[PDB]
Amino acid sequence: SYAKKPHISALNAPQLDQRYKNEFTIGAAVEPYQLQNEKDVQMLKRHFNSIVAENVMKPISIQPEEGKFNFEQADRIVKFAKANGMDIRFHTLVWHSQVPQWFFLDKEGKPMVNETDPVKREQNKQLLLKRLETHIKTIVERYKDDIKYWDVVNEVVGDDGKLRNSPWYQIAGIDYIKVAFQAARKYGGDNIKLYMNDYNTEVEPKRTALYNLVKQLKEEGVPIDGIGHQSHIQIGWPSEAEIEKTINMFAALGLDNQITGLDVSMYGWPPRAYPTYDAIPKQKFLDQAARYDRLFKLYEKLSDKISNVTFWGIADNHTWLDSRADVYYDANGNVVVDPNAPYAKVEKGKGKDAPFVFGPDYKVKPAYWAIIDHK
Ligand SMILES: [Cl-]
Numbered sequence: 001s002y003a004k005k006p007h008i009s010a011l012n013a014p015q016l017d018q019r020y021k022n023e024f025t026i027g028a029a030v031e032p033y034q035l036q037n038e039k040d041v042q043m044l045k046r047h048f049n050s051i052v053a054e055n056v057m058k059p060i061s062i063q064p065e066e067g068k069f070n071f072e073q074a075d076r077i078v079k080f081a082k083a084n085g086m087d088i089r090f091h092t093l094v095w096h097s098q099v100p101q102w103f104f105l106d107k108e109g110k111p112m113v114n115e116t117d118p119v120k121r122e123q124n125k126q127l128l129l130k131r132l133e134t135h136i137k138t139i140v141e142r143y144k145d146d147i148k149y150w151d152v153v154n155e156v157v158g159d160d161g162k163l164r165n166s167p168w169y170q171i172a173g174i175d176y177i178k179v180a181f182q183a184a185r186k187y188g189g190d191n192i193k194l195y196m197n198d199y200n201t202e203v204e205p206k207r208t209a210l211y212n213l214v215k216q217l218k219e220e221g222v223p224i225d226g227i228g229h230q231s232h233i234q235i236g237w238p239s240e241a242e243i244e245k246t247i248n249m250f251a252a253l254g255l256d257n258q259i260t261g262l263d264v265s266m267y268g269w270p271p272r273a274y275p276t277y278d279a280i281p282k283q284k285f286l287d288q289a290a291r292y293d294r295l296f297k298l299y300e301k302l303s304d305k306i307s308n309v310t311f312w313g314i315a316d317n318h319t320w321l322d323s324r325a326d327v328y329y330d331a332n333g334n335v336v337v338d339p340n341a342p343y344a345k346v347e348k349g350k351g352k353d354a355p356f357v358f359g360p361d362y363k364v365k366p367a368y369w370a371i372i373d374h375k
């Protein structure tokens with residue numbers, strides 16, 4: 001939007017959540033250590049009214065061995081949110097990544113996916129489903145009074161438009177999704193809100209597969225209240241038109257929509273990253289600000305169908321996108337960022353992305369001014 005507008009400390013900037021408070025909550029994803037850092041604490045207090053765990057509420061973080069529950073890290077995020085009046089999202093009860101392998105071992109300690117006996121396969125399904133229910137039961141019995149929004153399952157639809165063929169699906173079929181939602185409703189009650197969370201929700205054939213799956217589950221009475229759109233997006237993709245079509249399509253089913261992991265990468269896919277923040281040209285930040293301007297104008301247009309927009313981080317000094325920021329080098333050792341250009345080697349995850357409206361020094365970016373205004 002504007003470059004006249006100064007690069008001031010975000011701790012002196014108009015509050016993001018208050019700008020959007022009648023449209024949707026504004027959330028940030030966090031690690032417990034950020035709650036012991038003065039600037040991160042002040043950022044959350046000043047700008048955000050919703051919170052989610054980057055990592056410490058994922059399955060392997062909560063029950064790394066059967067019967068060993070580590071709630072200590074998740075508790076710290078819950079305590080902070082309650083003390084500051086923030087909504088909490090739980091990420092996530094079921095996922096094919098960051099998930100302990102003991103879930104999928106049969107009683108003899110062998111991988112359940114290798115079982116060929118159909119009678120044993122059925123016993124493995126029921127055992128996996130029992131373990132799934134106990135994991136969800138224990139978590140929801142602890143947090144049902146504190147955590148309003150739940151990513152019950154994450155990424156269960158494949159990018160090929162089929163259900164994702166994870167061990168969950170190989171072993172139990174579609175019932176693991178039904179069991180997860182039924183268990184969360186049973187032990188959590190009517191007041192927690194249950195979401196199916198995924199990325200590339202705008203992209204066919206994934207989008208229609210997600211649509212059909214949710215429609216079918218709600219016809220069968222499986223409790224599902226909304227869709228989580230991870231929204232790990234780029235400056236130019238996906239188009240605002242396709243985002244709008246997606247949000248409307250699920251709203252038509254009676255589903256809430258939440259933007260659960262928003263970041264606007266500086267790069268394409270696979271990314272060709274700059275090696276450092278300082279090397280990103282100023283024009284990239286202007287392009288990103290214009291993208292954020294259109295994006296939040298669209299969220300506001302659709303505000304009656306969106307209850308929350310959560311960024312997957314606080315400020316540019318910390319983003320999981322850095323793990324994807326591969327730096328490409330030509331034969332002379334110069335950085336290559338042109339997506340089709342010659343190159344000799346790549347340094348995977350060594351570069352720097354810049355996906356938020358707050359810079360790594362906790363000063364506001366052009367993208368912040370683009371979404372704090374009313375134009
Ligand atoms: Cl991270």
Ligand SMILES: [Cl-]
Pocket residue numbers: 359360361363
């Ligand atoms: Cl800066």
Ligand SMILES: [Zn+2]
Pocket residue numbers: 019374
């Ligand atoms: Zn306003």
Ligand SMILES: [Zn+2]
Pocket residue numbers: 015017018045046047048049
């Ligand atoms: Zn606030």
Ligand SMILES: [Zn+2]
Pocket residue numbers: 276277278
């Ligand atoms: Zn630097």
Ligand SMILES: [Zn+2]
Pocket residue numbers: 022023024303304305306307308
């Ligand atoms: Zn709303």
Ligand SMILES: [Zn+2]
Pocket residue numbers: 031054318319320
């Ligand atoms: Zn992180």
Ligand SMILES: [Zn+2]
Pocket residue numbers: 320
């Ligand atoms: Zn992630």
Ligand SMILES: [Zn+2]
Pocket residue numbers: 007359361363
């Ligand atoms: Zn700066």
Ligand SMILES: [Zn+2]
Pocket residue numbers: 001293297369370371372373374375
């Ligand atoms: Zn604007």
